Every structure is written in structure tokens, then in C-alpha cells.
Amino acid sequence: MFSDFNMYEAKVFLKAVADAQNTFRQTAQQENQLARYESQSQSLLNGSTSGAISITG
Amino acid sequence: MLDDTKYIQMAQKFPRNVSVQLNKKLFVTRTWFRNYYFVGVFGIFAYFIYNQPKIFAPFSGYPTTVAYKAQPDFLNDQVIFYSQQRQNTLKNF
């Protein structure tokens, strides 16, 4: 259809676009994962201190 | 027609109690020469045929692979891993 040169141009550009979308995903996931870990740790601390649960072993 | 008279006679009339003892050492020597020329000569060809496809076509021999994802564990300085089974497939042609 198109010369091989244009096909490889398209391949490179598509690789870059996929990498950009992965960059968006990585940024959002890292931020929310840090927030999640903080929230879960705080929840476990509050639970143990409040006497709601006992965490042993 | 070939004049097979004497061979026909030999076939018809052969002794049925004559046997010869065989020197075990010489029999073993010849057989182990045969083994030497099988393992060390034809073995090369056989191993090439058996293995070369496994070198130039490796993806068909390992069907399933594993992938990992990791998360930190700050309060314990650990790393938590989640595994996943995948079909081992080509990638980045």
C-alpha cells in the first residue's frame, strides 16, 4: 500500500503513542497507589489502637 | 537361467549340529567399534536433527510464561509481588 519507509514511520509513531498512554497510566497509578498505601496503613493503626481488632502474627 | 545347482544342493543339505565357539573378547571389540561409530559419528547428525529446530524455533517449546507486578511495603521495607500466567508469544517483530 505505502512504501516501507512510511510504514516504519507509522510503526515508530504508534510505539511512541502507546508509550505516552502508558506514561499517563503509570503517573496516575503511582499517585493513587501511594495514597492507597497511606490510607490502608492508617486504617490498620486506628483499628488496632481503637481495640476494634487484634493483629497477631 | 543361472546354473545354481551347487548352491541349491548347499541349501537343501546343511549340517544341523555344527557350531563354533565365539571368542567373547573379539565379538565385544567389534561391537564396541560399532558403538563408537554410532554414538560419536551418527550421534552428531542425530543430535543436529533433534536440536537445531529447538534452536531456531524456541517459542514453540515453552508455551506458558509468567509475568510479575510489584508494590512497595514501606512500613516493613518489603516488596510485594503479584504473578500472572501468560501465553508465551512473539513481541516487537
Ligand SMILES: CCCCCCCCCCCCCCCCCC(=O)OC[C@H](COP(=O)(O)OCCN)OC(=O)CCCCCCCCCCCCCCCCC
Ligand atoms: C545417570 C546414570 C548414568 C549411567 C551411565 C552408565 C554408562 C556405562 C557405560 C559403559 C561403557 C563400557 C565400555 C566398554 C568398552 C569395551 C571395549 C573392549 O572390550 O574392547 C577393547 C578394544 C581395544 O582396542 P584395540 O585397538 O584392539 O587394543 C587392544 C587392547 N587389548 O577397544 C576398542 O577397540 C575401542 C572401544 C571403543 C569404545 C567406545 C565406547 C563408547 C561409549 C558411549 C557411551 C554413550 C553413553 C551416553 C549416555 C547419555 C546420558 C545423557
